[PDB]
Design an enzyme around this catalytic site. Sequence first.
Site, mmCIF file in Angstrom:
data_model
loop_
_atom_site.group_PDB
_atom_site.id
_atom_site.type_symbol
_atom_site.label_atom_id
_atom_site.label_comp_id
_atom_site.label_asym_id
_atom_site.label_seq_id
_atom_site.Cartn_x
_atom_site.Cartn_y
_atom_site.Cartn_z
ATOM 1 N N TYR A 178 0.836 -1.193 0.000
ATOM 2 C CA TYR A 178 0.000 0.000 0.000
ATOM 3 C C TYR A 178 0.876 1.250 0.000
ATOM 4 O O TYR A 178 1.971 1.252 0.564
ATOM 5 C CB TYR A 178 -0.889 0.022 1.241
ATOM 6 C CG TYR A 178 -1.950 -1.046 1.251
ATOM 7 C CD1 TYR A 178 -3.016 -1.009 0.352
ATOM 8 C CD2 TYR A 178 -1.892 -2.099 2.164
ATOM 9 C CE1 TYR A 178 -4.003 -1.999 0.364
ATOM 10 C CE2 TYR A 178 -2.870 -3.092 2.183
ATOM 11 C CZ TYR A 178 -3.920 -3.035 1.283
ATOM 12 O OH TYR A 178 -4.883 -4.019 1.296
ATOM 13 N N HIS B 257 -1.823 1.273 -3.325
ATOM 14 C CA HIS B 257 -1.762 0.715 -4.671
ATOM 15 C C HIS B 257 -3.015 1.110 -5.433
ATOM 16 O O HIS B 257 -3.981 1.610 -4.854
ATOM 17 C CB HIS B 257 -1.590 -0.814 -4.679
ATOM 18 C CG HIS B 257 -2.786 -1.571 -4.199
ATOM 19 N ND1 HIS B 257 -2.833 -2.190 -2.971
ATOM 20 C CD2 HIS B 257 -3.983 -1.808 -4.786
ATOM 21 C CE1 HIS B 257 -4.007 -2.777 -2.820
ATOM 22 N NE2 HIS B 257 -4.723 -2.559 -3.905
ATOM 23 N N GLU C 174 -5.794 3.118 -3.205
ATOM 24 C CA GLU C 174 -6.345 2.821 -1.893
ATOM 25 C C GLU C 174 -5.235 2.724 -0.861
ATOM 26 O O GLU C 174 -4.115 2.301 -1.161
ATOM 27 C CB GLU C 174 -7.154 1.521 -1.903
ATOM 28 C CG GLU C 174 -6.386 0.289 -2.299
ATOM 29 C CD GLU C 174 -7.155 -0.978 -1.986
ATOM 30 O OE1 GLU C 174 -7.397 -1.238 -0.788
ATOM 31 O OE2 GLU C 174 -7.519 -1.711 -2.926
ATOM 32 N N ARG D 77 -10.501 1.368 4.038
ATOM 33 C CA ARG D 77 -9.569 2.062 3.145
ATOM 34 C C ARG D 77 -10.062 3.455 2.768
ATOM 35 O O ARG D 77 -11.263 3.704 2.713
ATOM 36 C CB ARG D 77 -9.433 1.293 1.824
ATOM 37 C CG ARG D 77 -9.124 -0.183 1.937
ATOM 38 C CD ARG D 77 -7.646 -0.458 2.147
ATOM 39 N NE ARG D 77 -7.411 -1.895 2.197
ATOM 40 C CZ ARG D 77 -7.591 -2.650 3.276
ATOM 41 N NH1 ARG D 77 -8.005 -2.107 4.414
ATOM 42 N NH2 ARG D 77 -7.399 -3.962 3.199
ATOM 43 N N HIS E 43 -14.358 -3.629 3.511
ATOM 44 C CA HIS E 43 -14.668 -5.011 3.160
ATOM 45 C C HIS E 43 -15.765 -5.500 4.103
ATOM 46 O O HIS E 43 -16.410 -6.513 3.847
ATOM 47 C CB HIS E 43 -13.454 -5.929 3.351
ATOM 48 C CG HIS E 43 -12.385 -5.765 2.318
ATOM 49 N ND1 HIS E 43 -12.625 -5.907 0.968
ATOM 50 C CD2 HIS E 43 -11.053 -5.551 2.443
ATOM 51 C CE1 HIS E 43 -11.488 -5.791 0.305
ATOM 52 N NE2 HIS E 43 -10.518 -5.573 1.177
ATOM 53 N N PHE F 270 -15.939 -4.616 -1.844
ATOM 54 C CA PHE F 270 -16.037 -3.409 -1.019
ATOM 55 C C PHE F 270 -17.441 -2.799 -1.064
ATOM 56 O O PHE F 270 -18.181 -2.984 -2.030
ATOM 57 C CB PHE F 270 -15.084 -2.326 -1.546
ATOM 58 C CG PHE F 270 -13.637 -2.529 -1.198
ATOM 59 C CD1 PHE F 270 -13.190 -2.364 0.108
ATOM 60 C CD2 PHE F 270 -12.706 -2.814 -2.193
ATOM 61 C CE1 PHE F 270 -11.839 -2.471 0.419
ATOM 62 C CE2 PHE F 270 -11.350 -2.927 -1.890
ATOM 63 C CZ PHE F 270 -10.917 -2.752 -0.580
#
Length: 104
Positions: free
Chosen positions: A38, A40, A58, A77, A92, A100
């Site tokens: 991350y 990414h 994110e 995120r 999530h 998501f």
Amino acid sequence: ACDYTCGSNCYSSSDASTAQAAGYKLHEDGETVGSNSYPHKYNNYEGFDFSVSSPYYEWPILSSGDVYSGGSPGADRVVFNENNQLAGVITHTGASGNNFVECT
Ligand SMILES: Nc1nc2c(ncn2[C@@H]2O[C@H](CO)[C@@H](O)[C@H]2OP(=O)(O)O)c(=O)[nH]1
Ligand SMILES: [Mg+2]
């Protein structure tokens, strides 16, 4: 009250801005952290209708209030773009598999 509610996690706009600032800086320096590397690219498979343009990236936002520095990213995120504009906050939690849903 929460500005963003991800499942049972409560976030304020300041929490989101703080996370976003950290993610964008690493993005600008071309560095990543964590096993999932991350921040990414976020492809938006879900097809969310964000008001800001892509590309999207994110980065984890943590319920602890701390900035992500590695380890478990959790389920939440923040999504931002190349212009460092906040697209939204997703999770999530309450979504099947690795999909998501937006935080309310
Ligand atoms: N659900 C979902 N996963 C995405 C998206 N863009 C990138 N991913 C990544 O695609 C793979 C399958 O979901 C994962 O590696 C996931 O990374 P994260 O797990 O870090 O989100 C997106 O738009 N939606
Ligand atoms: Mg907070």
